[PDB]
Design a protein around this ligand. Structure first.
Ligand SMILES: *Cc1c(COP(=O)(O)O)cnc(C)c1O
Ligand SMILES: *Cc1c(COP(=O)(O)O)cnc(C)c1O
Ligand SMILES: [Cl-]
Ligand SMILES: [Cl-]
Ligand SMILES: [Cl-]
Ligand SMILES: [Cl-]
Ligand SMILES: [Mg+2]
Ligand SMILES: [Mg+2]
Ligand SMILES: [Mg+2]
Ligand SMILES: [Mg+2]
Ligand SMILES: [Mg+2]
Ligand SMILES: [Mg+2]
Ligand SMILES: [Mg+2]
Ligand SMILES: [Mg+2]
Ligand SMILES: [Mg+2]
Lengths: 387, 387
């Protein structure tokens, strides 16, 4: 037991979630339920690792000890049944930096790169900002409200594509893809000699009855065709420490990314990231399991509240991530109108669905990694906004 | 007064200086006097800013409050008499990453970039790793042992150059360029429409009777032709925190670098870098002044020791930086022989002059930002090596 009910003031915590809404929504005087970090304290093991490193009193250039990558190897093996080699790992300050460099190195200007919308908006922008062409294969929104891949669409568009960027679990719709769904996609990509970059940052935030399957874990051929991005940051609420890794089982790919990070001279973890990453994987599993029980309770509470109190809204329980994807289309409001009522009448900040691209219109994304009290206040504000 | 004589054992401090010699020198069992970080504890104000941040116990995405760039603006004004606008500042995790992106955006493949050797080795590799053409204008080593710029050579090689990368103060030779030296260089570059990137990371480490002059501060004409990189990291020994900034008074340059950082999605300080940077500039001046007295004492001690005890070596007192550039050529040993006898017999790890490019042969670089006891030991081991 860790006390996830505890409310922590973040008004003095140099938090973008609490302090950068003015830019985006027009004011900071809103209840923030938008950007994906949590309103929970880091695991005690993380905090103590930071304290111990702080007490050294010298903060020079940091070497990466073998125990760091060993912690990552062991995490992936015991949590995801995927045994990797330490030699396959590259440090990156974040997932999107790594994907950016990978796009620059693995493709030529104007090459086609495929994603599936609605999705995390940096997928769309990182392609365009690198002067490659973005090809969107929208997820299919079924008449039952759920989302699946559009395999027929992918096969129709795949012929001149060079890379496919997968979100697994998929933010914002909350899908934890099954082995069979991943096998179908992976076989298509292999048939067409398309490499997959799998963004698996949400890999540890998986609800009951679901299991994360790394795309690269399915078979040795999928392993060699997949470059995987993961991090401790979403799992343990340590984005402010900046730490991620890339698993590249193909040495040609490894060399290209290693050379790219040499080119921009980004090689070392900061000193706190170093210790917190190792501490989170070696010692954070008990906190994580407790977090996932608390999160599932928040999810169930939120869905029940919505279905009882805002019955015009439609919501499907996510299989993973701590983000809820809620359909407001029955209100008959344009996306701008919906944002305006939520901000001005509700005083609540949710992520606008349209920001995730095709299939986002009419939706809003709500962050449930917060104390129940804060979640309830958010739901009350939404109820007031739409009434 | 601060206790610079205190030895801080860095064996458990995940320090690259103490733990990465095996790669470069064959063995970890050497006294490290190479990589430029200090063997001193951080200023109290830094340690405590980190502790107070740590005790908030939430490490999510970090906003940059106005106070952070205000600290930088105020520092540049009161320390260097250079009044900048906060709107000119772009965050970078380091100086070389910023220069790398600057090179990619301000020039085309195979364009010419000029540097002055011997110089910090990333200046050479950042140009070549970006597939630009490197035009070296060696510094002129005078028969009195000092270094000046080779203006004739610059004028002869500059006609087709796009960018000039200036080191001010110049690592490793320790020059603090005078206003007149900088004016002469700047005018040559302006005549030929050559933009100057000025790496001024050593700007605060300035010895008595010398004064740092930002190239961009000389005039408005110079300001619009100059892009400046600075950081708290060398000053305050916080390279493990990762923080630097770029001053771009030209809005077109600002937009190109802003867009580059958007492309690789590196925008936010880590949470600890944020608080330490502001604390160092708002509260660290007293520590800095004390450090500069201790450093100058160490320099005077080392030069006296060398001239008395290793009289075939030649050394000139640095005007800036904490790095001592010592000529071993009178021993009649090759660079290879020299390196062997220092590592294997002295058991001392110095930076080999040849790593700094043209004009480095015969030289070794020693880091003097350590307790006197450690400096004495290094000098004793160098003496033992060459006897
Ligand atoms: C939050 C998030 C990230 C974070 O990216 P960084 O560049 O590591 O900050 C990456 N991918 C997805 C799908 C996310 O939701
Ligand atoms: C130490 C040093 C740097 C540091 O580079 P970062 O990329 O900030 O680590 C840059 N320039 C010079 C001249 C240096 O001596
Ligand atoms: Cl379904
Ligand atoms: Cl309703
Ligand atoms: Cl002489
Ligand atoms: Cl001698
Ligand atoms: Mg301790
Ligand atoms: Mg097959
Ligand atoms: Mg397997
Ligand atoms: Mg209903
Ligand atoms: Mg406090
Ligand atoms: Mg702000
Ligand atoms: Mg010209
Ligand atoms: Mg002599
Ligand atoms: Mg003595």
């Amino acid at each position: 037991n860790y006390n996830f009910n505890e409310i922590v003031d973040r008004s003095n915590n140099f938090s973008s979630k609490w302090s950068e809404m003015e830019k985006k929504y027009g004011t900071n005087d809103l209840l923030p339920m938008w950007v994906a970090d949590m309103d929970f304290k880091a695991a005690p093991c993380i905090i103590d690792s930071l304290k111990n490193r702080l007490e050294q009193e010298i903060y020079g250039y940091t070497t990466r000890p073998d125990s760091y990558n060993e912690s990552i190897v062991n995490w992936l093996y015991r949590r995801h049944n995927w045994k990797i080699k330490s030699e396959w790992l590259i440090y990156s300050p974040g997932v999107i930096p790594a994907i950016s460099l990978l796009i620059n190195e693995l493709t030529k200007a104007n090459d086609k790169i495929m994603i599936q919308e609605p999705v995390y908006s940096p997928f769309n922008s990182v392609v365009k900002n690198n002067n490659r062409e973005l090809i969107i294969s929208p997820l299919q929104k079924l008449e039952n409200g759920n989302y699946i891949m559009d395999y027929e669409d992918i096969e129709n568009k795949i012929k001149d594509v060079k890379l496919f960027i997968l979100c697994n679990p998929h933010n914002p719709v909350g899908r934890v893809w099954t082995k069979d769904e991943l096998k179908k996609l992976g076989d298509i990509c292999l048939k067409h000699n398309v490499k997959i970059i799998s963004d698996e940052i949400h890999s540890d935030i998986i609800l009951k009855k679901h299991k994360h399957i790394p795309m690269a874990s399915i078979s040795k051929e999928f392993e060699k065709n997949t470059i995987t991005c993961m991090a401790p940051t979403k799992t343990f609420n340590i984005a402010g420490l900046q730490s991620s890794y890339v698993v590249l089982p193909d040495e040609k790919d490894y060399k290209l990314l290693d050379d790219a990070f040499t080119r921009i001279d980004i090689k070392r973890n900061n000193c706190f990231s170093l210790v917190a990453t190792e501490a989170s994987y070696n010692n954070g599993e008990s906190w994580l399991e407790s977090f996932l029980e608390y999160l599932e309770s928040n999810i169930d509470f939120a869905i029940k509240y919505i279905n009882e109190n805002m019955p015009k809204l439609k919501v499907r329980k996510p299989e993973g991530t701590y983000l809820l994807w809620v359909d407001f289309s029955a209100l008959g409001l344009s996306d701008e109108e919906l944002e305006s009522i939520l901000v001005q009448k509700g005083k609540v900040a949710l992520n606008q669905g349209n920001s995730f691209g095709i299939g986002g219109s009419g939706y809003q994304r709500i962050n449930l990694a917060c104390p129940r009290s804060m979640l309830e206040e958010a739901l009350i504000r939404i109820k007031n906004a739409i009434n």
